[PDB]
């Protein structure tokens, strides 16, 4: 489960997920730093 640069892999849904959905979080996925730091 390697996915595109602006998404992370969710294990519950076995699917890759847009980082914007986690960005406002205290503890976002690491692979959403680069993308998530477009703000």
């Amino acid at each position, epitope marked *: 489960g390697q996915c595109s640069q602006n*998404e992370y892999f*969710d294990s*519950l*849904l*076995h*699917a*890759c*997920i*847009p980082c*914007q*959905l*986690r*960005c*406002s*979080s*205290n503890t*976002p996925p690491l692979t959403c730093q680069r993308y998530c730091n477009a703000s």
Partner: nanobody
Amino acid sequence: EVQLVESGGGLVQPGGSLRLSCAASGFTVSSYGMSWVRQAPGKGPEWVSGIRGSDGSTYYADSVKGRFTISRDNSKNTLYLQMNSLRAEDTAVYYCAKQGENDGPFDHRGQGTLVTVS
């Protein structure tokens, strides 16, 4: 505790439209981020649409922009996927899911509902 009871799948002819339901139990749909994911047989699950909990922003995969609309009815406490202008590759099991507090990880999903497009 928390459940997501889905309904609204079935058969529809190419070009048709369909409306999926995802009724929350044990929580309020308005209070969290929810999205829809789908899995066609032979393929891995695919994220499709989503509402961000923190600001109610809506998002859509490319394959589905212009045709699909996610929303919530607070009074019925359900998430919906309005699907228009359907096509053969929109055929999958559709799954709603819910995120933790403060745009957290997905913590629950519905049982699934089958959408078949001839």
